[PDB]
Amino acid sequence: MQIEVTVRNITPIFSAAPGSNYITIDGTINPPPGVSRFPLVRTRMMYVAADVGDGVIKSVPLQIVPGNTMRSLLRRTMLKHVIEPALVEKGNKLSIGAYATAYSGNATGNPDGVPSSFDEIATMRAHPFIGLFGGGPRMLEGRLMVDSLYPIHTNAERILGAGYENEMMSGPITQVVWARRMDPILNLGSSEDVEVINGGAVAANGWIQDLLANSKANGRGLKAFNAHEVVIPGLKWVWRISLDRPTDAQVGLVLLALNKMTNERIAGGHSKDYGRFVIDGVSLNGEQVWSQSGITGGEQYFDAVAEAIDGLSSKEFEQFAQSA
Amino acid sequence: MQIEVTVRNITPIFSAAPGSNYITIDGTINPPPGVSRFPLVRTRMMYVAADVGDGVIKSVPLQIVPGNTMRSLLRRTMLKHVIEPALVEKGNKLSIGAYATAYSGNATGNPDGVPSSFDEIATMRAHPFIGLFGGGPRMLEGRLMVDSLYPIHTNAERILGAGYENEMMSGPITQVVWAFNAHEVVIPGLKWVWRISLDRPTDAQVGLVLLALNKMTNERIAGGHSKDYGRFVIDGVSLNGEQVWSQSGITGGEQYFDAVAEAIDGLSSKEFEQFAQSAK
Amino acid sequence: MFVKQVFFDLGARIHADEARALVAKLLDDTQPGLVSALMNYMPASKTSKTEFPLVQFSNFNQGFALLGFGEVGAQILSDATPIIHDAMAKLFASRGQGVVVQVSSRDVPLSCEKRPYGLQYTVAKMVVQKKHEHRERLANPETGKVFLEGLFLRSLERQAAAVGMVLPRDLVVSFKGAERVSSVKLRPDSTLAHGSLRHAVFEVNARLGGLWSVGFLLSKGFGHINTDLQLGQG
């Protein structure tokens, strides 16, 4: 079962690529030393083979949001607005391990050596939340295959073989966004502002001297300057959600998580409002089901997840999490 | 609550973008040779995917105020308008570290890698201001989300396509005001869209956002105070997709205001101290 | 090498010379040696050094600035800044409600290279006349022009040699004109005054890329402006 979630990003997308990268005042990502490099955390990039010129395929950059990131995102919306309301309406109580395994695939960092008995595999695989995301102490396989967010871009013409041939962006899709820290005690100005600090003006003054003693001279003070590379907004992305012999309840759960997908953020940089997005279209095995009012279609999936929400107990999450 | 406000600038707005840019004259903005250079300070420009070319989507240069600037602007407006005057009486005088944590993110740099206990996170994110603006030493998630200021532009119409069929802007969006060094600035007389969003809010938090929004027309956004730039007014605050603004102010959403007012009465210094101490 | 500027804001404007007098009078009872370092006194006596002043006080729109030239002068500012800040803090907390004193710091490198075209550099409040012979040169424009030429040049070479960097010795300067003529008093309510030029314009073929102080009474805060700020700027 194949799902293709085509979205447009309202705010810019920052999913931080690990790597202490550096930036100058105008471009030159990771310059040579002595040009006064500034710290730079770039957005997550996937190298991708692409048709660069006629007959030549090169490994080129393309900035993505990771499939692991949005696997955990889909699992998170699934659990916060469907699963947790079900377990509050029936009063079912999860354990610490059951909660942590339902959100993270494991209760501890040690998976168990034994494999689960086949009845437990069949019952858990049949269960929609467990089937979509496996794991646990006995390392269950899940039915969900969450692919990364590629933009609809020339670097992904080799990726989008079927469909999405139009709406192709030629140029780069990143902008460097600069954030500075400022010290408020440097910027306060007035003593009527410092009448709310206990200790008066002399305490604020003494902190100014601490920072002056740091300015002459490794406890970090304040007032840093940073840049972070972001993916530019308004561009169409594609999400691929593949399923592995799914029950109708698992697909209905995915569509239940998918309808509210917009409230959440496909990114990091929470405070900067990075990750806001609107779903342009959703296709089940290629068929378009998406409307402005969520998903229009797939009624057997919605009915199956309706009957699977009912009778969903905590004990499924408890038994799977419990280590041998 | 996905709060959205339109703000129209009445003076130029100059959110000075970092860059070593130089200008000669209005004909050429960045000269290839070194003839008659004059140092140029760009304000914020955000590249955007837009429909230029009648069907194809291309990155389009656009000019904004960053959401981190306006995040601190919201911070200072509520802190310097609501938190400070409600906080100054009944004692409850803030620590200077709690000050620095209120207006910046943290009190210091190098925040401690030990996380905070859940009771800490539960009562900080239930505080109207502390949970809005997270961080501190143990690095709280802030429920409040602040957008960048997009001018209501045909280059940004893919961002704001639903509610705005008309009042679209096309043509030039800047002009270089000289004073020698010349600063390229956004033209006065723009409608802008600001999106404030909140995930799982207590009513006092969004009430603080509304109290802050009411007194937002005092402070200048992205503006040199020497140049008196960034003056603006507010029309069109839509709360949850519904229009809750007038000339006198909000005139609606009285439960959020009632909750924030009770919350303001209950404001305490002790939760500021527990937000700001570095439990290293 | 580099020159350090440290800026102190008392909430009100204080002139550089009376700030120098105030800094002298504030820490006189205790911490005398730091004062000797700040004011370029002799190590043994109270009188000042005849060489270039590594540490010179300067104007600030909300108070006073300190300029330290070279590694030694920058170190003098580095060891002097917090004690000086603490002194104005206790002085301005003793009277009134109190004010909060805010600072800034900046390490500007100095540089020069010769260019085959003249460059317009203006200066403000630069002293020029100190003796009766200097008055006699100032009466006639022909003999006053070459005196101002030599004065501007020898000030450039002096602060070069003092900062520890080499200047090309083929520079040709020129003086166009000054807007006003005014006197400078060493101490208030003294009959002795010294002549000075206001908004003088000089033209040098080379470029200057740092803080460059010209003429007499440099530690009092006269005749220095930042050559980086004027550069390509009107």
XYZ file of N, CA and C in Angstrom, chain C:
702
model
N 49.313 48.048 14.740
C 48.596 46.827 15.087
C 47.101 47.094 15.230
N 46.631 47.216 16.472
C 45.217 47.437 16.748
C 45.069 48.444 17.881
N 43.957 49.178 17.847
C 43.598 50.152 18.872
C 42.244 49.755 19.456
N 42.146 49.774 20.780
C 40.920 49.428 21.481
C 40.157 50.682 21.895
N 38.849 50.684 21.648
C 37.952 51.740 22.104
C 36.957 51.147 23.089
N 36.856 51.760 24.270
C 35.896 51.369 25.300
C 35.027 52.578 25.624
N 33.716 52.392 25.585
C 32.756 53.482 25.676
C 31.968 53.353 26.964
N 31.848 54.459 27.703
C 31.136 54.503 28.971
C 30.037 55.554 28.904
N 28.828 55.149 29.304
C 27.606 55.943 29.219
C 27.086 56.174 30.630
N 27.125 57.422 31.085
C 26.593 57.779 32.393
C 25.128 58.193 32.348
N 24.499 58.160 31.177
C 23.176 58.719 31.006
C 23.168 60.198 30.704
N 24.328 60.845 30.736
C 24.464 62.254 30.413
C 25.816 62.463 29.755
N 25.888 63.468 28.891
C 27.116 63.743 28.163
C 28.125 64.423 29.077
N 29.351 63.912 29.081
C 30.458 64.549 29.775
C 31.612 64.722 28.792
N 32.177 65.930 28.763
C 33.282 66.250 27.870
C 34.523 65.448 28.232
N 35.397 65.251 27.237
C 36.556 64.372 27.396
C 37.554 64.909 28.417
N 37.801 66.222 28.409
C 38.783 66.796 29.325
C 38.277 66.798 30.763
N 37.008 67.158 30.969
C 36.466 67.116 32.322
C 36.223 65.681 32.770
N 36.027 64.753 31.823
C 36.026 63.339 32.189
C 37.403 62.895 32.641
N 38.454 63.387 31.979
C 39.820 63.078 32.389
C 40.094 63.617 33.797
N 39.634 64.845 34.071
C 39.760 65.421 35.410
C 38.956 64.630 36.439
N 37.761 64.165 36.058
C 36.918 63.401 36.974
C 37.520 62.035 37.276
N 38.069 61.365 36.258
C 38.718 60.067 36.443
C 39.956 60.215 37.317
N 40.685 61.323 37.147
C 41.809 61.616 38.027
C 41.356 61.843 39.466
N 40.215 62.511 39.662
C 39.843 62.892 41.023
C 39.136 61.759 41.768
N 38.458 60.889 41.011
C 37.686 59.741 41.569
C 38.567 58.657 42.216
N 39.679 58.272 41.578
C 40.533 57.154 42.079
C 41.841 57.658 42.705
N 41.959 58.967 42.932
C 43.208 59.571 43.469
C 43.560 59.038 44.868
N 42.568 58.852 45.745
C 42.827 58.478 47.134
C 43.397 57.071 47.243
N 42.916 56.189 46.359
C 43.347 54.765 46.292
C 43.608 54.372 44.831
N 44.322 53.261 44.609
C 44.645 52.767 43.239
C 45.381 53.839 42.419
N 46.418 54.518 42.960
C 47.145 55.561 42.222
C 47.901 55.067 40.978
N 48.513 53.879 41.052
C 49.316 53.348 39.930
C 48.499 53.162 38.662
N 47.289 52.609 38.784
C 46.387 52.425 37.615
C 46.191 53.791 36.952
N 46.057 54.839 37.772
C 45.884 56.236 37.275
C 47.138 56.617 36.482
N 48.318 56.240 36.988
C 49.597 56.536 36.291
C 49.579 55.834 34.929
N 49.104 54.585 34.896
C 48.990 53.844 33.642
C 47.965 54.482 32.708
N 46.854 54.972 33.263
C 45.779 55.509 32.443
C 46.196 56.831 31.836
N 46.960 57.635 32.618
C 47.211 59.028 32.273
C 48.551 59.318 31.699
N 49.317 58.273 31.502
C 50.660 58.337 30.995
C 51.544 59.253 31.840
N 51.487 59.083 33.160
C 52.417 59.771 34.043
C 53.782 59.098 34.009
N 54.743 59.746 34.655
C 56.015 59.097 34.890
C 55.850 58.021 35.958
N 56.686 56.973 35.924
C 56.621 55.950 36.987
C 56.923 56.482 38.380
N 57.739 57.528 38.491
C 58.118 58.062 39.791
C 57.385 59.342 40.166
N 57.135 60.232 39.213
C 56.572 61.542 39.499
C 55.165 61.660 38.916
N 54.593 62.856 39.063
C 53.235 63.136 38.622
C 53.169 63.663 37.193
N 54.269 64.207 36.669
C 54.246 64.805 35.339
C 54.121 63.731 34.263
N 53.661 64.144 33.086
C 53.300 63.199 32.045
C 54.489 62.906 31.135
N 54.354 61.834 30.359
C 55.402 61.433 29.434
C 55.431 62.350 28.217
N 56.642 62.620 27.730
C 56.840 63.462 26.557
C 56.619 62.695 25.254
N 56.508 61.370 25.314
C 56.289 60.582 24.112
C 54.815 60.628 23.697
N 54.459 59.768 22.745
C 53.074 59.653 22.282
C 52.199 59.076 23.402
N 50.954 59.534 23.574
C 50.114 58.903 24.596
C 49.355 57.664 24.127
N 49.774 56.504 24.641
C 49.118 55.245 24.275
C 47.644 55.235 24.673
N 47.319 55.868 25.791
C 45.956 55.938 26.296
C 45.471 57.378 26.194
N 44.421 57.592 25.394
C 43.856 58.956 25.205
C 42.333 58.925 25.384
N 41.792 59.848 26.187
C 40.326 59.947 26.420
C 39.648 60.493 25.157
N 38.384 60.122 24.928
C 37.666 60.606 23.718
C 36.180 60.860 24.000
N 35.565 61.711 23.171
C 34.152 62.059 23.228
C 33.283 60.807 23.147
N 32.092 60.875 23.752
C 31.048 59.892 23.515
C 29.718 60.595 23.732
N 28.726 60.269 22.895
C 27.489 61.053 22.861
C 26.685 60.903 24.146
N 26.957 59.852 24.909
C 26.355 59.661 26.214
C 27.394 59.620 27.329
N 28.617 60.089 27.072
C 29.647 60.048 28.095
C 31.064 60.097 27.562
N 31.928 59.196 28.014
C 33.309 59.293 27.565
C 33.826 57.953 27.071
N 34.760 58.037 26.131
C 35.399 56.876 25.545
C 36.876 56.886 25.904
N 37.472 55.703 25.891
C 38.887 55.506 26.143
C 39.491 54.805 24.939
N 40.626 55.312 24.465
C 41.338 54.730 23.339
C 42.704 54.267 23.818
N 43.019 53.006 23.549
C 44.296 52.432 23.912
C 45.001 51.896 22.688
N 46.198 52.401 22.421
C 46.898 52.131 21.176
C 48.017 51.133 21.434
N 48.074 50.097 20.606
C 49.035 49.036 20.797
C 48.577 48.031 21.835
N 49.388 46.977 21.965
C 49.118 45.922 22.937
C 49.196 46.453 24.362
N 50.152 47.349 24.628
C 50.316 47.923 25.961
C 49.112 48.779 26.339
N 48.668 49.654 25.431
C 47.511 50.491 25.718
C 46.223 49.698 25.831
N 46.072 48.667 24.993
C 44.915 47.785 25.097
C 44.919 47.023 26.416
N 46.102 46.617 26.887
C 46.212 45.973 28.191
C 45.893 46.947 29.319
N 46.269 48.221 29.153
C 45.950 49.241 30.152
C 44.440 49.420 30.267
N 43.748 49.479 29.123
C 42.284 49.529 29.153
C 41.690 48.252 29.735
N 42.307 47.103 29.441
C 41.799 45.821 29.921
C 41.884 45.703 31.439
N 42.981 46.171 32.031
C 43.081 46.160 33.486
C 42.403 47.356 34.138
N 42.087 48.404 33.378
C 41.534 49.606 33.979
C 40.014 49.665 33.946
N 39.377 49.030 32.953
C 37.933 49.150 32.720
C 37.009 48.814 33.906
N 37.145 47.683 34.633
C 36.105 47.405 35.643
C 36.200 48.280 36.883
N 37.427 48.593 37.310
C 37.621 49.466 38.506
C 37.050 50.855 38.193
N 37.305 51.360 36.981
C 36.797 52.697 36.550
C 35.264 52.666 36.510
N 34.691 51.578 35.987
C 33.215 51.423 35.893
C 32.613 51.391 37.302
N 33.298 50.719 38.231
C 32.842 50.583 39.608
C 32.895 51.922 40.330
N 33.883 52.752 39.983
C 33.978 54.093 40.548
C 32.824 54.985 40.099
N 32.507 54.999 38.801
C 31.372 55.822 38.383
C 30.046 55.239 38.868
N 29.991 53.918 39.070
C 28.800 53.295 39.632
C 28.555 53.753 41.064
N 29.603 53.776 41.896
C 29.398 54.222 43.273
C 29.182 55.735 43.342
N 29.814 56.500 42.439
C 29.602 57.947 42.414
C 28.183 58.301 41.987
N 27.634 57.573 41.017
C 26.295 57.887 40.548
C 25.210 57.141 41.308
N 25.579 56.204 42.182
C 24.622 55.625 43.113
C 24.603 56.349 44.451
N 25.642 57.140 44.747
C 25.651 57.923 45.981
C 24.588 59.018 45.967
N 24.414 59.696 44.835
C 23.480 60.808 44.716
C 22.348 60.437 43.768
N 21.129 60.847 44.118
C 19.967 60.567 43.300
C 19.458 59.149 43.477
N 18.564 58.760 42.563
C 18.058 57.390 42.557
C 19.132 56.411 42.102
N 20.090 56.885 41.311
C 21.091 56.026 40.719
C 20.883 55.918 39.226
N 21.958 55.710 38.471
C 21.869 55.428 37.046
C 22.613 54.128 36.777
N 22.383 53.575 35.591
C 23.037 52.348 35.154
C 24.008 52.709 34.031
N 25.247 52.275 34.172
C 26.312 52.694 33.275
C 26.597 51.574 32.285
N 26.436 51.877 30.998
C 26.576 50.903 29.928
C 27.797 51.205 29.074
N 28.380 50.139 28.539
C 29.691 50.186 27.915
C 29.604 49.616 26.511
N 30.712 49.764 25.793
C 30.962 48.988 24.583
C 32.468 48.867 24.402
N 32.900 47.885 23.611
C 34.322 47.663 23.379
C 34.540 47.202 21.946
N 35.656 47.635 21.361
C 35.924 47.360 19.956
C 37.424 47.445 19.688
N 37.944 46.473 18.934
C 39.377 46.369 18.645
C 39.613 46.595 17.153
N 39.849 47.839 16.755
C 39.968 48.211 15.347
C 41.430 48.091 14.930
N 41.752 47.311 13.903
C 43.118 47.329 13.372
C 43.397 48.609 12.599
N 44.659 49.030 12.633
C 45.133 50.161 11.848
C 45.901 49.665 10.632
N 45.765 50.394 9.527
C 46.458 50.032 8.301
C 46.625 51.264 7.428
N 47.522 51.139 6.454
C 47.753 52.175 5.461
C 48.367 51.524 4.233
N 48.071 52.086 3.057
C 48.796 51.813 1.819
C 48.750 53.074 0.966
N 49.790 53.271 0.162
C 49.903 54.430 -0.716
C 49.059 54.215 -1.966
N 48.280 55.228 -2.341
C 47.503 55.209 -3.573
C 47.918 56.385 -4.445
N 47.873 56.236 -5.794
C 48.220 57.342 -6.696
C 47.056 58.289 -6.991
N 46.330 58.681 -5.944
C 45.260 59.664 -6.042
C 45.021 60.242 -4.657
N 44.766 61.548 -4.613
C 44.533 62.210 -3.343
C 43.200 61.826 -2.730
N 43.140 61.916 -1.404
C 41.976 61.505 -0.638
C 41.660 62.564 0.408
N 40.367 62.857 0.553
C 39.867 63.946 1.385
C 39.546 63.422 2.778
N 40.252 63.942 3.782
C 40.122 63.533 5.174
C 39.907 64.788 6.006
N 38.777 64.881 6.693
C 38.521 66.043 7.532
C 38.797 65.701 8.992
N 39.093 66.725 9.786
C 39.293 66.581 11.223
C 38.570 67.734 11.911
N 38.189 67.526 13.166
C 37.472 68.520 13.949
C 38.166 68.703 15.290
N 38.185 69.955 15.767
C 38.766 70.353 17.082
C 40.236 69.934 17.228
N 41.076 70.206 16.222
C 42.517 69.842 16.320
C 43.342 71.092 16.660
N 44.085 71.041 17.772
C 44.951 72.166 18.239
C 46.147 72.297 17.289
N 46.614 73.527 17.041
C 47.744 73.728 16.141
C 48.791 74.699 16.674
N 48.434 75.659 17.523
C 49.346 76.729 17.916
C 49.726 76.547 19.376
N 51.031 76.470 19.648
C 51.505 76.307 21.015
C 52.501 77.358 21.480
N 53.291 77.945 20.586
C 54.281 78.934 20.980
C 54.097 80.177 20.128
N 54.880 81.212 20.452
C 54.782 82.478 19.731
C 55.237 82.326 18.286
N 56.196 81.426 18.045
C 56.616 81.113 16.683
C 55.481 80.480 15.891
N 54.672 79.640 16.546
C 53.510 79.050 15.888
C 52.470 80.110 15.546
N 52.366 81.155 16.374
C 51.531 82.300 16.025
C 52.098 83.043 14.822
N 53.427 83.173 14.758
C 54.052 83.909 13.660
C 53.925 83.165 12.335
N 53.932 81.828 12.368
C 53.649 81.076 11.147
C 52.187 81.200 10.737
N 51.276 81.304 11.704
C 49.851 81.330 11.400
C 49.378 82.657 10.820
N 50.197 83.710 10.880
C 49.771 85.005 10.359
C 49.757 85.019 8.834
N 50.782 84.445 8.206
C 50.898 84.415 6.758
C 50.512 83.041 6.237
N 49.612 82.963 5.246
C 49.165 81.645 4.750
C 50.258 80.803 4.109
N 51.242 81.431 3.458
C 52.299 80.678 2.783
C 53.190 79.950 3.786
N 53.581 80.630 4.863
C 54.405 79.983 5.877
C 53.586 79.178 6.879
N 52.262 79.318 6.874
C 51.421 78.530 7.755
C 51.008 77.219 7.126
N 50.913 77.232 5.790
C 50.552 76.035 5.036
C 51.574 74.926 5.241
N 52.862 75.244 5.068
C 53.918 74.236 5.163
C 54.087 73.761 6.607
N 53.785 74.632 7.577
C 53.803 74.224 8.978
C 52.698 73.214 9.261
N 51.499 73.454 8.721
C 50.416 72.489 8.892
C 50.699 71.186 8.146
N 51.361 71.279 6.984
C 51.818 70.106 6.238
C 52.736 69.239 7.084
N 53.792 69.858 7.622
C 54.748 69.142 8.441
C 54.152 68.619 9.727
N 53.199 69.356 10.308
C 52.541 68.922 11.536
C 51.693 67.677 11.305
N 50.867 67.693 10.249
C 50.036 66.536 9.914
C 50.893 65.325 9.576
N 51.957 65.545 8.789
C 52.847 64.448 8.438
C 53.515 63.878 9.692
N 54.190 64.720 10.483
C 54.934 64.232 11.647
C 54.028 63.618 12.714
N 52.748 64.011 12.772
C 51.803 63.303 13.631
C 51.516 61.894 13.114
N 51.376 61.740 11.786
C 51.158 60.407 11.209
C 52.348 59.474 11.468
N 53.564 59.970 11.211
C 54.786 59.192 11.456
C 55.004 58.894 12.943
N 54.669 59.849 13.821
C 54.804 59.623 15.255
C 53.869 58.529 15.744
N 52.605 58.531 15.303
C 51.735 57.534 15.910
C 51.943 56.169 15.233
N 52.497 56.173 14.007
C 53.004 54.955 13.369
C 54.138 54.312 14.132
N 55.144 55.117 14.457
C 56.303 54.603 15.159
C 55.905 54.154 16.550
N 54.929 54.842 17.140
C 54.458 54.466 18.462
C 53.628 53.188 18.429
N 52.845 52.975 17.366
C 52.021 51.774 17.300
C 52.847 50.563 16.877
N 54.023 50.779 16.301
C 54.891 49.691 15.918
C 54.702 49.152 14.518
N 54.210 49.961 13.584
C 54.055 49.548 12.197
C 54.746 50.554 11.285
N 55.093 50.107 10.086
C 55.853 50.920 9.143
C 54.904 51.703 8.230
N 55.158 53.014 8.116
C 54.526 53.878 7.122
C 55.464 54.128 5.959
N 54.947 54.071 4.736
C 55.724 54.509 3.574
C 56.035 55.997 3.660
N 57.303 56.326 3.436
C 57.820 57.666 3.659
C 57.800 58.519 2.397
N 56.911 58.217 1.451
C 56.777 58.995 0.226
C 55.424 59.690 0.142
N 54.749 59.857 1.274
C 53.421 60.453 1.276
C 53.511 61.957 1.064
N 52.595 62.491 0.264
C 52.462 63.931 0.086
C 51.064 64.331 0.547
N 51.006 65.208 1.540
C 49.742 65.680 2.074
C 49.501 67.092 1.557
N 48.270 67.567 1.736
C 47.914 68.935 1.384
C 46.759 69.375 2.267
N 46.679 70.681 2.509
C 45.674 71.262 3.392
C 44.839 72.251 2.594
N 43.523 72.034 2.570
C 42.627 72.869 1.778
C 42.109 74.070 2.563
N 41.563 73.838 3.749
C 41.005 74.923 4.529
C 40.336 74.399 5.779
N 40.087 75.327 6.699
C 39.425 75.030 7.959
C 38.195 75.911 8.090
N 37.142 75.370 8.705
C 35.899 76.127 8.806
C 35.974 77.224 9.863
N 36.508 76.931 11.048
C 36.498 77.936 12.103
C 37.826 77.935 12.845
N 38.036 78.985 13.635
C 39.212 79.129 14.485
C 38.726 79.401 15.900
N 39.193 78.607 16.862
C 38.738 78.766 18.237
C 39.859 78.410 19.198
N 39.700 78.844 20.442
C 40.703 78.621 21.468
C 40.361 77.400 22.310
N 41.398 76.844 22.925
C 41.297 75.697 23.814
C 41.961 76.080 25.127
N 41.222 75.931 26.223
C 41.724 76.201 27.562
C 42.208 74.900 28.184
N 43.422 74.927 28.740
C 43.946 73.746 29.418
C 43.179 73.474 30.707
N 43.015 74.499 31.544
C 42.173 74.429 32.726
C 41.119 75.525 32.640
N 39.929 75.304 33.206
C 38.918 76.368 33.225
C 39.332 77.523 34.121
N 38.826 78.714 33.770
C 39.102 79.984 34.455
C 40.602 80.282 34.515
N 41.284 80.012 33.406
C 42.681 80.377 33.222
C 42.767 81.320 32.035
N 43.620 82.340 32.147
C 43.773 83.296 31.056
C 44.470 82.672 29.854
N 45.333 81.688 30.111
C 46.085 81.058 28.998
C 45.136 80.236 28.120
N 45.194 80.472 26.806
C 44.444 79.716 25.817
C 45.355 79.437 24.633
N 45.015 78.401 23.871
C 45.828 77.975 22.739
C 44.961 77.881 21.492
N 45.502 78.328 20.361
C 44.729 78.348 19.133
C 44.449 76.958 18.599
N 43.355 76.848 17.848
C 42.904 75.570 17.330
C 42.009 75.793 16.119
N 41.998 74.800 15.231
C 41.229 74.838 13.995
C 40.014 73.930 14.122
N 38.924 74.305 13.456
C 37.676 73.556 13.484
C 37.286 73.164 12.066
N 37.042 71.857 11.882
C 36.658 71.230 10.611
C 37.697 71.473 9.519
N 38.962 71.227 9.851
C 40.033 71.333 8.872
C 39.963 70.173 7.887
N 40.375 70.433 6.650
C 40.368 69.429 5.592
C 41.800 69.204 5.133
N 42.217 67.944 5.100
C 43.522 67.537 4.614
C 43.326 66.542 3.479
N 44.337 66.416 2.627
C 44.253 65.539 1.465
C 45.543 64.745 1.359
N 45.436 63.426 1.478
C 46.597 62.542 1.481
C 46.425 61.501 0.380
N 47.504 61.260 -0.377
C 47.469 60.282 -1.461
C 47.237 58.866 -0.947
N 47.782 58.532 0.217
C 47.559 57.224 0.804
C 46.174 57.152 1.444
N 45.764 55.934 1.783
C 44.541 55.695 2.535
C 44.927 55.343 3.964
N 44.052 55.697 4.893
C 44.197 55.370 6.296
C 42.999 54.549 6.751
N 43.263 53.435 7.435
C 42.198 52.517 7.799
C 42.076 52.197 9.276
N 42.296 53.187 10.137
C 42.146 52.981 11.566
C 41.834 54.262 12.312
N 42.167 54.317 13.598
C 42.114 55.577 14.326
C 43.468 56.273 14.210
N 43.466 57.514 13.730
C 44.694 58.265 13.489
C 44.512 59.631 14.141
N 45.396 59.957 15.081
C 45.325 61.197 15.844
C 46.397 62.146 15.344
N 46.017 63.396 15.148
C 46.912 64.385 14.579
C 46.950 65.582 15.515
N 48.124 66.252 15.564
C 48.372 67.480 16.312
C 48.644 67.315 17.774
N 48.422 68.402 18.504
C 48.811 68.478 19.894
C 47.629 68.177 20.805
N 47.963 67.878 22.070
C 47.010 67.560 23.143
C 46.113 66.380 22.769
N 46.748 65.259 22.421
C 45.996 64.097 21.957
C 45.309 63.375 23.109
N 45.935 63.359 24.289
C 45.343 62.699 25.448
C 44.141 63.446 26.007
N 43.995 64.728 25.692
C 42.849 65.517 26.112
C 41.629 65.267 25.230
N 41.810 64.593 24.099
C 40.699 64.298 23.219
C 40.511 65.307 22.112
N 41.584 65.679 21.426
C 41.523 66.649 20.345
C 42.228 66.092 19.121
N 41.642 66.331 17.954
C 42.264 65.977 16.694
C 42.420 64.498 16.415
N 41.471 63.672 16.853
C 41.366 62.320 16.325
C 39.945 62.080 15.835
N 39.821 61.550 14.615
C 38.558 60.996 14.135
C 38.877 59.678 13.440
N 37.881 58.796 13.387
C 38.077 57.472 12.814
C 38.115 57.559 11.296
N 39.242 57.143 10.724
C 39.419 57.249 9.287
C 38.661 56.158 8.540
N 38.278 55.089 9.235
C 37.434 54.067 8.626
C 36.040 54.612 8.341
N 35.530 55.468 9.232
C 34.155 55.942 9.104
C 34.010 56.937 7.963
N 35.012 57.790 7.755
C 34.930 58.740 6.651
C 35.101 58.061 5.299
N 35.725 56.878 5.277
C 36.193 56.236 4.051
C 35.048 55.859 3.122
N 34.983 56.517 1.968
C 33.888 56.313 1.032
C 32.547 56.760 1.570
N 32.537 57.795 2.405
C 31.346 58.224 3.121
C 31.267 59.743 3.119
N 30.092 60.269 2.789
C 29.832 61.695 2.846
C 28.564 62.024 3.611
